Structures are given as structure tokens and as C-alpha cells.
Design a protein around this ligand. Structure first.
Ligand SMILES: O=C(O)CNC(=O)C(=O)O
Ligand SMILES: [Mg+2]
Ligand code: NI
Ligand SMILES: [Zn+2]
Length: 331
């Protein structure tokens, strides 16, 4: 069995290997990369996403989100308070202000320590989930707006044509902006490209051990767990590496830098934080190996998770027994 300890693997494809996206994902899986839940892909030196980032300041962040924490430093939830619209140039200035800028630090490990010590005492503002793309249309390799769609994959594997679309999203971050513990909708893959700026630290639980994280989360968030049998779908709970280690939960960590891709694999729980002002692009995708995970994915039906239009067909076709309850939660 390849990668039996479920370590995060780092790949360096050549320019020839960077042509065929599906083939390279399957290659990484042949080497056991999915066992970690997360892999890093460093593009060949010949590749670029676009020519420059000099002209992005007028992008609008219609609904910036202030991430307010409750709990203790290692075990907390966050809610998202909506703020007034601002441009990416305005948001960048805000991120660099004395109130929000990254503190002085020695290295990524010192900054990680500072994040976990101090996160709860601040409320950073995240420009998340903005439909759009920063890949140039002429970039033919690993262009996150030109991937094969999940609807086409379902149709190819199962024969059923469905409605829905699959487009990328932009994330503008600052110091301490946080992504809560989650797997993707319908336990899909994700791919995330860090276009510019400061790093993103990731934590990940191997898919084979996801239920250990879920059991811990029910213990640590007992009100939330009574409210919903899949409350991590709400994407609000944080648990620190120290707390995971104290509770014996298998996990790994890695820091993504600008110019690097990360892939999350089906049912790979992940969480993390941004080091300072940055911009990422991410999208969900599927492969044949996903279908079995999609059929078994948990679902939130309490009303909180509320998701895209395109998840309807995935539930309806893959999970017909659950569909009526799930759809009630959507309405
Ligand atoms: O970058 C972020 O805030 C969160 N991204 C992801 O969870 C992802 O790419 O799957
Ligand atoms: Mg612009
Ligand atoms: Ni994710
Ligand atoms: Zn729920």
C-alpha cells in the first residue's frame, strides 16, 4: 500500500506532465497521495497563471466577512458578520493596517504559535467565496476555470445528464483569517491555487480517519452536535493541533506559498489560516474515484449549511433516500 503513514506528498510535475490534469491526479493517487487528504503541487518553472497581478485592485468584495470567535484558544467557533462592500485595493490597505497586519515573527512555526495563542482575541475580515477567476484565458495547463465539470463526470460515470454548473471562487485573506474544519460539499475534491501574497497554513486529517475527527468534534461542541448530525458542514468549528494531539487524532500540516497548488481529496477534513494579505482561487472537482464518496457523504438537513444550486442533483441522483429530508433543509 503506497503512503501507509498518510503523509502529505509534494509533487513537481514537468511541463509535459502538467498537460493532462486528470492523468496527473490519477498519478498522484497511484503514489498514495490521497491517503493524506491533501497534496501540494509545485508547477513547472515554465508555467504561469497570468502575466501580472498589477491590475486586480478594482475587483469588488461585495460582502466581506468579519470572523468573530467564541470559545477557548484551542477550541472555538466563528461566526461571520457581514461588512460593507469594498474593493480589493481597499481590502489590501485594510489588511496592511496596524490593526490587522501580520506581527513580527521569526519563521512559519513562530507565526503558527502566535495564531493559536491569539486568534480568538481578534476578528479578521475575509473576502471569501467571490465567483470569478484570475487565470489568463490563454493559460492552458491547470487553469481552474477550464476544468472538466462535475456534472460531466457524473454523466460520464453514471449515464445521467443533470443540470448545474461548476465555477471557481476567489478568496482574499488577511492575517488570522480562518477556514474551519470541513470536507467539501458531497465529499468532492478541491483544488486551490495561491495566486499572490502571504502563505496559507493547512491542517488535514487522513480520509481513513475522518470519523475520529467527527467523534472529537461531537465531544468538544456538544450543543452543536445535538443540533445537527453533520454540524461540521456548517463550517464554523476550529480545533488546534495541540488539542488534536492531546486527543490522539491523526493529522498533518503544511504551509502553501504563492505559486503553489493544493489538492484536497474526498473526505479529507481540512482547516487553516492565512499569514497576511493574499488571494487564492479554488474549485471543486470529481474523478471516477469520487463517486463512491459522494454516495456516502453526510449531509446537514438542519437548515444551517445552505449550499449551491448544483448540489441538488448530486443528492438527488447519488442519495435518493436522503433527498427529501435534505431538500427540506434547503427550504
Ligand atoms: O482557502 C480557504 O479559505 C479555504 N479553502 C478550501 O477549503 C479549499 O480550497 O478546499
Ligand atoms: Mg481590477
Ligand atoms: Ni475546502
Ligand atoms: Zn446542520
Amino acid at each position: 500500500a503506497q503512503n501507509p503513514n498518510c503523509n502529505i506528498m509534494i509533487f513537481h510535475p514537468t511541463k509535459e506532465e502538467f498537460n493532462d490534469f486528470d492523468k496527473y491526479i490519477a498519478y498522484m493517487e497511484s503514489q498514495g497521495a490521497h491517503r493524506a487528504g491533501l497534496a501540494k503541487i509545485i508547477p513547472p518553472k515554465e508555467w504561469k497563471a497570468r502575466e501580472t497581478y498589477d491590475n486586480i485592485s478594482e475587483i469588488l468584495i461585495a460582502t466581506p466577512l468579519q470572523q468573530v470567535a467564541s470559545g477557548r484558544a484551542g477550541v472555538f467557533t466563528q461566526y461571520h458578520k457581514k461588512k460593507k462592500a469594498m474593493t480589493v485595493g481597499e481590502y489590501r490597505h485594510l489588511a496592511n493596517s496596524k490593526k490587522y497586519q501580520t506581527p513580527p515573527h521569526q519563521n512559519f512555526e513562530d507565526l503558527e504559535r502566535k495564531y493559536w495563542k491569539n486568534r480568538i482575541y481578534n476578528s479578521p475580515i475575509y473576502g471569501a467565496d467571490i465567483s470569478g477567476s484570475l487565470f489568463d484565458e490563454n493559460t492552458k495547463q491547470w487553469n481552474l476555470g477550464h476544468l472538466g465539470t462535475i456534472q460531466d463526470l457524473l454523466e460520464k460515470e453514471c449515464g445521467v445528464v443533470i443540470e448545474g454548473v461548476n465555477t471557481p471562487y476567489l478568496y482574499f485573506g488577511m492575517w488570522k483569517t480562518t477556514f474551519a474544519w470541513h470536507t467539501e460539499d458531497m465529499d468532492l475534491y478541491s483544488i486551490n491555487y495561491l495566486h499572490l501574497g502571504e502563505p496559507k497554513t493547512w491542517y488535514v486529517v487522513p480520509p481513513e480517519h475522518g470519523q475520529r475527527l467527527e467523534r472529537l468534534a461531537r465531544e468538544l461542541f456538544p450543543g452543536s452536535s445535538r443540533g445537527c448530525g453533520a454540524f461540521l458542514r456548517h463550517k464554523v468549528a476550529l480545533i488546534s493541533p495541540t488539542v488534536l494531539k492531546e486527543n490522539g487524532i491523526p493529522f498533518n500540516r503544511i504551509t502553501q506559498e504563492a505559486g503553489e497548488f493544493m489538492v484536497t481529496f474526498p473526505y479529507g477534513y481540512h482547516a487553516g489560516f492565512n499569514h497576511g494579505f493574499n488571494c487564492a482561487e479554488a474549485i471543486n472537482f470529481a474523478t471516477p474515484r469520487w463517486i463512491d464518496y459522494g454516495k456516502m457523504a453526510s449531509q446537514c438537513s438542519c437548515g444551517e449549511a445552505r449550499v449551491t444550486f448544483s448540489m441538488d442533483a448530486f443528492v438527488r441522483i447519488l442519495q435518493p433516500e436522503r433527498y427529501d429530508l435534505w431538500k427540506r433543509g434547503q427550504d
